[PDB]
Amino acid sequence: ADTIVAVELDTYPNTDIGDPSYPHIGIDIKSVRSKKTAKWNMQNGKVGTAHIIYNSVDKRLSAVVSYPNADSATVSYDVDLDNVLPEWVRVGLSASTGLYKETNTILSWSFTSKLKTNALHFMFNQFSKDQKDLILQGDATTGTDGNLELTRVSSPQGSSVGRALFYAPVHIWVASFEATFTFLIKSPDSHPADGIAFFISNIDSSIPSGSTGRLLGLFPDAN
Amino acid sequence: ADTIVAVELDTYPNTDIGDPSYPHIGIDIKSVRSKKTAKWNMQNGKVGTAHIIYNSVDKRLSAVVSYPNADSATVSYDVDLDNVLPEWVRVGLSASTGLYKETNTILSWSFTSKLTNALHFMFNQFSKDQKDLILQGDATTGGNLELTRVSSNGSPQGSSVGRALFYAPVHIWEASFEATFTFLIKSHPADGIAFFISNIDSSIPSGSTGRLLGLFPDAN
Numbered sequence: 001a002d003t004i005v006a007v008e009l010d011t012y013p014n015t016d017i018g019d020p021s022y023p024h025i026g027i028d029i030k031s032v033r034s035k036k037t038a039k040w041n042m043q044n045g046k047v048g049t050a051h052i053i054y055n056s057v058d059k060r061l062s063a064v065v066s067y068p069n070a071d072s073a074t075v076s077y078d079v080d081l082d083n084v085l086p087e088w089v090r091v092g093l094s095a096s097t098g099l100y101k102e103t104n105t106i107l108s109w110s111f112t113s114k115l116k117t118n119a120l121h122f123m124f125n126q127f128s129k130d131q132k133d134l135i136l137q138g139d140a141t142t143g144t145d146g147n148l149e150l151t152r153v154s155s156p157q158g159s160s161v162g163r164a165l166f167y168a169p170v171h172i173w174v175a176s177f178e179a180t181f182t183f184l185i186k187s188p189d190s191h192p193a194d195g196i197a198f199f200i201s202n203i204d205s206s207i208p209s210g211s212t213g214r215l216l217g218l219f220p221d222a223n
Numbered sequence: 224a225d226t227i228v229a230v231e232l233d234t235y236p237n238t239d240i241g242d243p244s245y246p247h248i249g250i251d252i253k254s255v256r257s258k259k260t261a262k263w264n265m266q267n268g269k270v271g272t273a274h275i276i277y278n279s280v281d282k283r284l285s286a287v288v289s290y291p292n293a294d295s296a297t298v299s300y301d302v303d304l305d306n307v308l309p310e311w312v313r314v315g316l317s318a319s320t321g322l323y324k325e326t327n328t329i330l331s332w333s334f335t336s337k338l339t340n341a342l343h344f345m346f347n348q349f350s351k352d353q354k355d356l357i358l359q360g361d362a363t364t365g366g367n368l369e370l371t372r373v374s375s376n377g378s379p380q381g382s383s384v385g386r387a388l389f390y391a392p393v394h395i396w397e398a399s400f401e402a403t404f405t406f407l408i409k410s411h412p413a414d415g416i417a418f419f420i421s422n423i424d425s426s427i428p429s430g431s432t433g434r435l436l437g438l439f440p441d442a443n
């Protein structure tokens with residue numbers, strides 16, 4: 001199986017697999033069952049921003065999600081990436097839908113990593129119809145209104161999964177990275193599902209079979 | 224396979240499986256490859272003390288090892304016990320030797336856990352038939368607990384593994400705990416002593432002498 005470190009923006013509580021009873025953001029280390037979560041007052045139809053940061057000095061992964069004019073949701077956790085991830089990885093964005101659904105629209109994505117010094121930076125503020133520096137998996141598509149649609153849209157569809165990975169491998173392991181993305185999750189359902197994640201993976205990571213819904217396109221099961 | 228959280232006092236560097244290049248203390252969460260380590264200035268033949276603490280407020284596992292009039296060695300790490308361990312556990316001490324060897328002698332051992340429901344035990348002496356301990360492998364009692372095999376002349380043996388678990392199951396989440404032990408390692412020494420928390424049915428995995436400390440079935 002693939003090795004995954006991720007930050008999830010989990011819009012749909014699946015309390016049967018350990019997710020708190022409310023929308024939450026969490027840090028996922030080799031399992032969909034987050035090591036730590038924070039309540040997320042998710043806003044249907046508004047543009048939100050997510051910011052992820054890591055350094056090898058304190059070796060803590062930290063994330064914050066926000067909308068303009070509202071309090072943000074943060075979470076942080078100890079993790080030594082040398083133990084969890086291979087030395088070279090692939091960075092990406094993942095999303096899914098299940099029974100319930102929502103748009104998983106990405107309007108912008110930036111990433112910076114330094115390994116001290118060698119560095120990689122990319123910034124997307126728009127996405128073209130053939131964005132050759134992204135590897136699109138599953139249902140993900142680019143270029144409709146200049147955005148990245150991680151899951152299928154006609155209006156959002158159910159039982160969809162998709163992801164977009166930066167084309168180049170990244171040398172992940174002082175060592176550090178940051179990622180930022182903007183997203184629009186809209187849904188006609190009064191329950192949106194399921195969510196978006198920023199992830200870091202083995203270079204040859206692919207969508208696990210049966211990873212729609214509560215598995216976010218990241219994991220082959222809920223273990 | 225068992226589920227293990229442990230504090231290791233690692234006397235022998237196995238750099239081929241990620242242990243730093245010096246004796247160290249480490250926090251192990253479901254792998255012998257420590258999540259975090261600190262350098263440990265181990266003192267051959269001198270009684271040492273280890274203290275381990277955990278609370279569900281900050282959900283951090285901490286540990287300190289020291290000797291009289293020396294600097295201590297300390298390590299801490301975020302651990303959410305609910306998503307690592309089963310709800311009921313046993314607690315114990317484990318040790319091993321390999322191609323290099325040491326005595327792994329425990330002179331006292333205490334433990335406290337609160338959830339209020341509470342459990343506490345304190346051993347400042349061990350008897351020959353210590354009915355509230357489960358002895359696994361080469362471990363023996365009777366006033367000390369000898370985790371690994373010591374011959375009749377008092378010299379340790381290689382290729383040995385042994386554990387002692389408290390007799391009752393322990394309710395570890397539904398939260399805090401503390402453990403202390405004192406030990407005497409005499410010998411290059413190998414391999415170390417751990418305090419661990421396990422599934423209730425845990426037993427020494429086959430082939431877990433040497434670097435695997437009696438805890439883990441492989442070095443994954």
Ligand SMILES: CCN(CC)c1ccc2c(c1)Oc1cc(N(CC)CC)ccc1C2c1ccccc1C(=O)OCCOCCOCCn1cc(CO[C@H]2O[C@H](CO)[C@@H](O)[C@H](O)[C@H]2O)nn1
Nearest residue numbers: 012013014016097098099100101192193194212213214215
């Ligand atoms: C009353 C509780 N709720 C409302 C939230 C509920 C909803 C749907 C079912 C529910 C229950 O129960 C079953 C049970 C089964 N069984 C087999 C005959 C008995 C277990 C078959 C299908 C469904 C279904 C079902 C019916 C029609 C079409 C599909 C299904 C269908 O998808 O159901 C999945 C199996 O649900 C079993 C019970 O799960 C707990 C309640 N529940 C169900 C769902 C819907 O989950 C699906 O969507 C989620 C959000 O997008 C994803 O996170 C998730 O990965 C995904 O499988 N959530 N909460």
Ligand SMILES: CCN(CC)c1ccc2c(c1)Oc1cc(N(CC)CC)ccc1C2c1ccccc1C(=O)OCCOCCOCCn1cc(CO[C@H]2O[C@H](CO)[C@@H](O)[C@H](O)[C@H]2O)nn1
Nearest residue numbers: 235236237239320321322323324412413414432433434435
């Ligand atoms: C730390 C220094 N290093 C790395 C360069 C090292 C490397 C090889 C040996 C080393 C030491 O020490 C011995 C000692 C012995 N003795 C006689 C039984 C004791 C003096 C025999 C073989 C070896 C060998 C040896 C030479 C050739 C072929 C095989 C081996 C040899 O050690 O074979 C056992 C399997 O080893 C594969 C190589 O492992 C990586 C390096 N390293 C360190 C050690 C000693 O390990 C053994 O003891 C440890 C301490 O109790 C245990 O933690 C551990 O589980 C255990 O396997 N092994 N290797």
Ligand SMILES: [Ca+2]
Nearest residue numbers: 010012013014
């Ligand atoms: Ca969920």
Ligand SMILES: [Ca+2]
Nearest residue numbers: 132133134167
């Ligand atoms: Ca090309």
Ligand SMILES: [Ca+2]
Nearest residue numbers: 233235236237
């Ligand atoms: Ca070792």
Ligand SMILES: [Mn+2]
Nearest residue numbers: 010019026034
């Ligand atoms: Mn979740």
Ligand SMILES: [Mn+2]
Nearest residue numbers: 233242249257
């Ligand atoms: Mn070690």
